[PDB]
């Protein structure tokens, strides 16, 4: 099979601005496990984000989450940008600052 | 209760990456890491501490290497280009009592077609691919027998080593900060999103209420953080006047009661 991923995106702790924080993509229900995951801020590439191992659910399909430290702002904007083979086009999830 | 490896080769990875790995688990939390470049297995997060028998993670080295060939083997048995991907969940569970209760499945490309029978000593399937792998180990003429050895000796053992060593990791409890907002949606409607931040272990309830009378779940999203924590979130739509008549509660190991929260 190929499943497509699911996309999440959310912070590890409520998001205060100016208070210091991780920003996270939890990917995850897909197959195979190929898969190309960059965080975005306004658009731009963020470089020193890291990743977890490669693991799978109870259903074979794959997960992944990838994290960067950052530091949140009323007019900042973040999203995650995915692409795997079952997309035509890489997938941008935007962060909203709640869910 | 329980102890779990997710192996899994791919026929062709992409370079820098591993064409093997595997992520040792106890109940919800990673304690084992190993892949085919580094070729060593190490500990996770609070596990690096965890006060070991010194030839411990030897041993988890040596049986995944075992693994390991037995996984690129599978490939060579295997009669297209593909690629493919053999994928396989082992470990165990202490039981209702103090014998062990082994799981040994596989999956090719994402479908179940394998398991291991423990009551024979043989891998089994319907598919001429799970019967050509099966053979094909089988015939690895030591695998068997380390496979049974693995699952009722080695892999239910460790179980108890970790759950006396690492016992306090394992009954680690944090309630999770909570939030309750409201965006606008649709006209005449917004959206409620309960938000439940850094908790474990992972589970948890999160269900609305319309004034005090029950609103149901919402829709749920649950996902991992970096430490091996966890988060949540659950969402209603509602109509835009009449938004501060939902609360939500939460209810969680962490804590000693089911909270309430308002917007």
């Not at chain 1, 977890?52 to 950052?70: A, G, I, N, P, R």
């Not at chain 2, 999203?221 to 939902?246: C, I, M, Q, R, W």
């Given at each position: 099979i190929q499943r497509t991923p699911k996309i999440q995106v959310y912070s590890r702790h409520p998001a205060e601005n100016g208070?210091?924080?991780?920003?996270?993509?939890?990917?995850?229900?897909?197959?195979?496990?190929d898969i190309e995951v960059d965080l975005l801020k306004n658009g731009?590439?963020?470089?020193?984000?890291?990743?977890?191992?490669?693991?799978?659910?109870?259903?074979?399909?794959?997960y992944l989450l990838y994290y960067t430290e950052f530091t949140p702002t009323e007019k900042d904007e973040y999203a995650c940008r995915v692409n795997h083979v079952t997309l035509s086009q890489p997938k941008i999830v935007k962060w909203d600052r709640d869910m | 209760l329980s102890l779990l490896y997710h192996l899994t080769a791919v026929s062709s990875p992409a370079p820098g990456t591993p064409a093997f790995w595997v992520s040792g688990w106890l109940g919800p939390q990673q304690y084992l890491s190993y892949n085919s470049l580094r070729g060593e297995a190490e500990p996770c997060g609070a596990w690096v501490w965890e006060n070991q028998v010194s030839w411990y993670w030897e041993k988890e080295t040596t049986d995944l290497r075992i693994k390991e060939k037995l996984f690129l083997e599978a490939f060579k048995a295997?009669?297209?280009?593909?690629?493919?991907?053999?994928?396989?969940?082992?470990?165990?569970?202490?039981?209702?009592?103090?014998?062990?209760?082994?799981?040994?499945?596989?999956?090719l490309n994402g479908e179940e077609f394998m398991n291991f029978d423990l009551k024979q000593g043989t891998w089994?399937?319907?598919?001429?691919?799970?019967?050509?792998?099966?053979?094909?180990?089988?015939?690895?003429?030591?695998?068997?027998?380390?496979?049974?050895?693995?699952?009722?000796?080695?892999?239910?053992?460790?179980?108890?080593?970790?759950?006396?060593?690492g016992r306090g990791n394992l009954e680690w409890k944090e309630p999770p900060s909570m939030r309750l907002k409201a965006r606008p949606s649709s006209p005449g409607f917004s959206v409620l999103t309960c938000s439940a931040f850094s908790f474990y272990p992972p589970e948890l309830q999160l269900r609305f209420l319309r004034n005090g009378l029950?609103?149901?779940?919402?829709?749920?999203?649950?996902?991992?953080?970096?430490?091996?924590?966890?988060?949540?979130?659950?969402?209603?739509?509602?109509?835009?006047?009449?938004?501060?008549?939902?609360?939500?509660?939460?209810?969680?190991?962490?804590?000693?009661?089911?909270?309430?929260?308002?917007?």
């Amino acid at each position: 099979i190929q499943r497509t991923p699911k996309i999440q995106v959310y912070s590890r702790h409520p998001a205060e601005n100016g208070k210091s924080n991780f920003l996270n993509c939890y990917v995850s229900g897909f197959h195979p496990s190929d898969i190309e995951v960059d965080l975005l801020k306004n658009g731009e590439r963020i470089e020193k984000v890291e990743h977890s191992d490669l693991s799978f659910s109870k259903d074979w399909s794959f997960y992944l989450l990838y994290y960067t430290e950052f530091t949140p702002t009323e007019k900042d904007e973040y999203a995650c940008r995915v692409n795997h083979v079952t997309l035509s086009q890489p997938k941008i999830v935007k962060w909203d600052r709640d869910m | 209760l329980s102890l779990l490896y997710h192996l899994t080769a791919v026929s062709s990875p992409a370079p820098g990456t591993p064409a093997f790995w595997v992520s040792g688990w106890l109940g919800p939390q990673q304690y084992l890491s190993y892949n085919s470049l580094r070729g060593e297995a190490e500990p996770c997060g609070a596990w690096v501490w965890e006060n070991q028998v010194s030839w411990y993670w030897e041993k988890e080295t040596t049986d995944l290497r075992i693994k390991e060939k037995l996984f690129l083997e599978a490939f060579k048995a295997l009669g297209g280009k593909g690629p493919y991907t053999l994928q396989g969940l082992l470990g165990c569970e202490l039981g209702p009592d103090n014998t062990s209760v082994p799981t040994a499945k596989f999956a090719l490309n994402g479908e179940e077609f394998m398991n291991f029978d423990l009551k024979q000593g043989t891998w089994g399937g319907d598919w001429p691919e799970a019967l050509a792998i099966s053979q094909r180990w089988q015939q690895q003429d030591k695998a068997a027998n380390k496979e049974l050895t693995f699952l009722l000796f080695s892999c239910p053992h460790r179980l108890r080593e970790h759950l006396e060593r690492g016992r306090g990791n394992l009954e680690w409890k944090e309630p999770p900060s909570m939030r309750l907002k409201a965006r606008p949606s649709s006209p005449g409607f917004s959206v409620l999103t309960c938000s439940a931040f850094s908790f474990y272990p992972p589970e948890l309830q999160l269900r609305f209420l319309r004034n005090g009378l029950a609103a149901g779940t919402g829709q749920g999203d649950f996902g991992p953080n970096s430490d091996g924590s966890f988060h949540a979130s659950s969402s209603l739509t509602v109509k835009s006047g009449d938004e501060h008549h939902y609360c939500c509660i939460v209810q969680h190991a962490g804590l000693a009661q089911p909270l309430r929260v308002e917007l």
